[PDB]
Enzyme design. Structure first.
Site, PDB file in Angstrom:
ATOM      1  N   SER A  23       0.884  -1.157   0.000  1.00  0.00           N
ATOM      2  CA  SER A  23       0.000   0.000   0.000  1.00  0.00           C
ATOM      3  C   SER A  23       0.904   1.183   0.000  1.00  0.00           C
ATOM      4  O   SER A  23       1.814   1.238  -0.805  1.00  0.00           O
ATOM      5  CB  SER A  23      -1.076  -0.046   1.153  1.00  0.00           C
ATOM      6  OG  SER A  23      -2.050   1.023   1.195  1.00  0.00           O
ATOM      7  N   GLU A  41      -8.689  -5.433  -4.873  1.00  0.00           N
ATOM      8  CA  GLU A  41      -8.094  -4.336  -4.158  1.00  0.00           C
ATOM      9  C   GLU A  41      -9.102  -3.424  -3.562  1.00  0.00           C
ATOM     10  O   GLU A  41      -8.953  -3.023  -2.408  1.00  0.00           O
ATOM     11  CB  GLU A  41      -7.145  -3.557  -5.048  1.00  0.00           C
ATOM     12  CG  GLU A  41      -6.020  -4.474  -5.526  1.00  0.00           C
ATOM     13  CD  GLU A  41      -4.922  -4.601  -4.468  1.00  0.00           C
ATOM     14  OE1 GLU A  41      -5.160  -4.327  -3.293  1.00  0.00           O
ATOM     15  OE2 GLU A  41      -3.807  -4.941  -4.829  1.00  0.00           O
ATOM     16  N   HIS A  94      -7.340  -6.086  -0.222  1.00  0.00           N
ATOM     17  CA  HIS A  94      -6.133  -5.352  -0.251  1.00  0.00           C
ATOM     18  C   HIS A  94      -5.512  -5.472   1.118  1.00  0.00           C
ATOM     19  O   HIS A  94      -5.990  -4.855   2.042  1.00  0.00           O
ATOM     20  CB  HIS A  94      -6.566  -3.921  -0.550  1.00  0.00           C
ATOM     21  CG  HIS A  94      -5.459  -2.905  -0.395  1.00  0.00           C
ATOM     22  ND1 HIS A  94      -4.881  -2.263  -1.422  1.00  0.00           N
ATOM     23  CD2 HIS A  94      -5.014  -2.315   0.809  1.00  0.00           C
ATOM     24  CE1 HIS A  94      -4.135  -1.291  -0.872  1.00  0.00           C
ATOM     25  NE2 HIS A  94      -4.201  -1.290   0.480  1.00  0.00           N
TER      26      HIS A  94
HETATM   27  C1  LIG Z   1     -11.772   6.227   7.808  1.00  0.00           C
HETATM   28  N1  LIG Z   1     -11.731   6.852   6.458  1.00  0.00           N
HETATM   29  C2  LIG Z   1     -13.055   6.778   5.790  1.00  0.00           C
HETATM   30  C3  LIG Z   1     -11.438   8.282   6.687  1.00  0.00           C
HETATM   31  C4  LIG Z   1     -10.696   6.246   5.597  1.00  0.00           C
HETATM   32  C5  LIG Z   1     -10.770   4.717   5.717  1.00  0.00           C
HETATM   33  C6  LIG Z   1     -10.202   3.853   4.591  1.00  0.00           C
HETATM   34  C7  LIG Z   1     -10.515   2.394   4.982  1.00  0.00           C
HETATM   35  C8  LIG Z   1      -9.971   1.331   4.037  1.00  0.00           C
HETATM   36  C9  LIG Z   1      -8.795   0.562   4.590  1.00  0.00           C
HETATM   37  C10 LIG Z   1      -9.030  -0.365   5.793  1.00  0.00           C
HETATM   38  C11 LIG Z   1      -7.687  -0.734   6.485  1.00  0.00           C
HETATM   39  C12 LIG Z   1      -6.465  -0.845   5.534  1.00  0.00           C
HETATM   40  C13 LIG Z   1      -5.137  -1.383   6.129  1.00  0.00           C
HETATM   41  N2  LIG Z   1      -4.175  -1.929   5.115  1.00  0.00           N
HETATM   42  C14 LIG Z   1      -4.066  -1.019   3.967  1.00  0.00           C
HETATM   43  C15 LIG Z   1      -2.819  -2.000   5.682  1.00  0.00           C
HETATM   44  C16 LIG Z   1      -4.602  -3.278   4.663  1.00  0.00           C
END
Ligand SMILES: C[N+](C)(C)CCCCCCCCCC[N+](C)(C)C
Ligand SMILES: C[N+](C)(C)CCCCCCCCCC[N+](C)(C)C
Lengths: 527, 527
Positions: free
Chosen positions: A197, A324, A437
């Site tokens: 990422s 993803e 992802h």
């Molecule tokens: C909270 N807001 C809406 C502001 C942004 C959240 C985006 C969430 C999608 C990712 C979930 C965890 C990802 C961790 N990794 C990338 C390491 C897998």
């Protein structure tokens, strides 16, 4: 003695940590820069002045200040990746996992964690380096770096908060690895920086910055490229976002120095709190404070750099995984819900695509739809669901990566590309999300070796094939010691990496990546 | 007596023509308008003043002056459709095939032949009405109409050469059919006008013109719509083309009346000769002199008419066949050749698409390519071949027809749509061309009943199913007396019409027709 090494900064006492039927020495928490507290907020990292006595590197360090996710409390699926040690502005440290016996000089792998540039931690359990170190005999270091406002604010001409300070934190952790890994048994001439990422996107950034190229050997990028839409803003936009944040704290916005001061006086959570009311649009997979392409650090636009070969020229290993999109869709697109089998309507679909391609004009949205809809059954709820799942994925990770692959294979020393598409058997997320992802990481770091956490035997095996390909690539410059072809700009081969006998295939998402990497841009360019 | 009828114009003596194991009475060559010779060139058709004595309608009439194809001399494939009686400016006549016994009052079908508005004839052998008349007991009339410069020149405000004079020739032949078919056993209250290519496109034009709607009952359109790109020019463009032709004859272009005079003094072939150096671009499937949307005849743009229901509201039967494109590609796109198995290169492909969408801008060509190329094997010569075959077809007949289908089914009294896709067994054209634009006709007109011309028995049968569906539709208003669904704007059903048990399918070329009928236009509209 085995747990007490002497480094150019001072001595550090680590610990024995069991791993499987054995042990390893672990040095948790070695500092590498100065705690960027208070006045130093938003400044570049200073190097850590050396110490006397032995530093006790036996406990993971504090985590950095960051956004904690409370969308699905207690649910391990979310919690997995949330910070687990108290967050602190003071959070610049490394973690090194060495074998016992300490090797003379072996391969080193540095893990830059991701998390959209707004979150992330070294200390997560899924980033436990012991299994890799142990099984492949490599030293493994994990680094911390400042994320978020604190890591990427960017009032351009002000030395008080220039951008990319968090990017430099990575670079300073790379230098200390260079200069001192030798006393840990590692070979500085063979350190690989890997990351997923935003980590995999940070990795490629260092392949491009003049100043970092020399600090590492090769790289492994997982679901990230330096050129993914979400990983960089212009100088302007970074300014823009810091007055906007300036306003959410009710700062003095006249004298730019006052903006900086005001924020330097707010407590960390205030900034975390209004951290998202500054983006400029309704969008899914887009983050507020990110790397600015400032000219210093990144001499010029990445497209130029990519286009001219101006970048480190080693071999890399990179890849993408099946779904993803899912995570962002789940957490941000209307209709989706953990617990539902989120069949989308054409209403919510058209809402969906707008969030996904936030910069597109209407004609542009038209083009996207036309490409992702099955006109022969234009409202099949599930097809609408999965179609958005590909729109986010392609546009945000697969296509920008295939771009970087394609440009860099014309000047690099070898490219190995994988496509991961295995659904772990014990995933807690709903099936619709698929190969999320983020879920390959657990395989790369050996968690399927631990019996206690219930994976299936073929996953144990898949995890070993992976860790090997990885470590074997980290030294040899190539992943196999059956043969995983090199990616080449002709018959662009890659392999699927799953529990079935790997198969080489060619041209990943070619039809769609033409649309995204060439068509759309030209359409949005015209009108 | 059976071969001597009395009509409001005078008496006419026909002939007995054998057909299978029997006979029919045929009235070949009845005049219906005045020979538009000399001074009357380019004027509207005058009605034919009645005669004394009996007119001898036993010989097919002269053909109209037109372009004769000498691309593949002697080859029946080409020659089939070339004019077969001396061409003459005097060429306005009908041909009627009646049963013996003459029926009291039966269904009538009028065949308007096609040929891009630059060629065509009544007298062709593939347009022999005896088999249909005979087998289904209908009277069949074929009409002649002026084509080409002579039929569609169009110096707008000049009554000496207003447009569409050839279109009116059709209408005048329709009126005489109305007024006199009764003395031939036909029922004027049930005449169906059918026609292919430009005939099927002329047919729909009459469904739209105020003045013609009343002259027929229902219609059958084959590979044509009034709205196919090639069938209409604006007023301007028609002017444009007549000064351009004016120049190729070195006419006086000052006084518009002088343009008209000059051309009225050139002999027919001169005009035939320079007839193509007037188009405005390099294009395949685009013709020089065609129907102008002049306001009179067509009150307004066809899109408005379609959009508002301003058109006759009967039921229609229409369809398209598999490889519409081929003929034009063969005769006009680089790389293709009868005799080769025309695998196209990506070079000639990109040349190909320009000829096909001559109005597109570059971005537009980009959009087309993206839609028709298999990026996963972007230079497979054969795929490039067939892909152009669909680009021409879709853009020039399938998509404009599905548009007309879709608009008209909201206000008409029933729509039956077929997709023909049978390759006759004895075709002379090369296999690559497939189901060519034009080859369904032979089935509709019963040539597979003649043993001498070697078709296979299942084709004999397919020809009978067709002729029936056709005649049965021509009276009943519906084609079946298994059931061929009505086309409806919901689950848009149609059937394949071939030698295997007809299968209903839905949404013909839906994905592509969205692109052509909605996407492209909006893209070329923006930029
Ligand atoms: C909270 N807001 C809406 C502001 C942004 C959240 C985006 C969430 C999608 C990712 C979930 C965890 C990802 C961790 N990794 C990338 C390491 C897998
Ligand atoms: C439609 N039917 C089946 C009745 C006859 C079509 C005969 C071949 C059509 C394509 C050739 C276009 C030629 C134009 N020129 C000769 C000017 C290139």
């Amino acid at each position: 003695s085995e747990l007490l090494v002497n480094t150019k900064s001072g001595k550090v006492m680590g610990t024995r940590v069991p791993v499987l039927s054995s042990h390893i020495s672990a040095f948790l928490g070695i500092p590498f820069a100065e705690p960027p507290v208070g006045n130093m907020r938003f400044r570049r990292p200073e190097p850590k002045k050396p110490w006397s006595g032995v530093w006790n590197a036996s406990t993971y360090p504090n985590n950095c200040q960051q956004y904690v996710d409370e969308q699905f409390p207690g649910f391990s699926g979310s919690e997995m990746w949330n910070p687990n040690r108290e967050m602190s502005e003071d959070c610049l440290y490394l973690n090194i996992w060495v074998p016992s016996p300490r090797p003379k000089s072996t391969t080193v792998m540095v893990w830059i964690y991701g998390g959209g540039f707004y979150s992330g931690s070294s200390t997560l359990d899924v980033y436990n380096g012991k299994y890799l170190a142990y099984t492949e005999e490599v030293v493994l270091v994990s680094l911390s770096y400042r994320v978020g406002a604190f890591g990427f604010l960017a009032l351009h001409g002000s030395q008080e908060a220039p951008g990319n300070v968090g990017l430099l934190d990575q670079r300073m952790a790379l230098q200390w690895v260079h200069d001192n890994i030798q006393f840990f048994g590692g070979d500085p001439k063979t350190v690989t920086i890997f990351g997923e990422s935003a980590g995999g996107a940070s990795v490629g950034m260092h392949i491009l910055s003049p100043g970092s190229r020399d600090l590492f050997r090769r790289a492994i990028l997982q679901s990230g490229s330096p050129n993914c839409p979400w990983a960089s803003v212009s100088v302007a936009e970074g300014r823009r976002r810091a007055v906007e944040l300036g306003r959410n704290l009710n700062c003095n916005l006249n004298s730019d120095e006052e903006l900086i001061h005001c924020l330097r006086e707010k407590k960390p959570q205030e900034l975390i709190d209004v951290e998202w009311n500054v983006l400029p649009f309704d969008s899914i997979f887009r983050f507020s404070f990110v790397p600015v392409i400032d000219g210093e650090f990144f001499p010029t636009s990445l497209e130029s750099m990519l286009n001219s070969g101006n970048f480190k020229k080693t071999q890399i290993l990179l890849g993408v995984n099946k779904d993803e999109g899912s995570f962002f869709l789940l957490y941000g697109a209307p209709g989706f819900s953990k617990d539902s089998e989120s069949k989308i309507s054409r209403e919510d679909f058209m809402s969906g695509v707008k969030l996904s391609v936030p910069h597109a004009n209407d004609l542009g949205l038209d083009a996207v739809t036309l490409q992702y809809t099955d006109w022969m059954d234009d409202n099949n709820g599930i097809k609408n669901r999965d179609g958005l799942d590909d729109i986010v994925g392609d546009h945000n990770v697969i296509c920008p990566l295939m771009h970087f692959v394609n440009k860099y294979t014309k000047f690099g020393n070898g490219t190995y590309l994988y496509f991961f598409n295995h659904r772990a058997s014990n995933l807690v997320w709903p099936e619709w999300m698929g190969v999320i992802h983020g879920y390959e990481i657990e395989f790369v770091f050996g968690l399927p070796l631990v019996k206690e956490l219930n994976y299936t035997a073929e996953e144990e095996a898949l995890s070993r094939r992976i860790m090997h390909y990885w470590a074997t690539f980290a030294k040899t410059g190539n992943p196999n010691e059956s043969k995983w072809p090199l990616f080449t700009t002709k018959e662009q081969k890659f392999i699927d990496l799953n529990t079935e006998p790997m198969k080489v295939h060619q041209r990943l998402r070619v039809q769609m990546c033409v649309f995204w990497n060439q068509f759309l841009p030209k359409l949005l360019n015209a009108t």
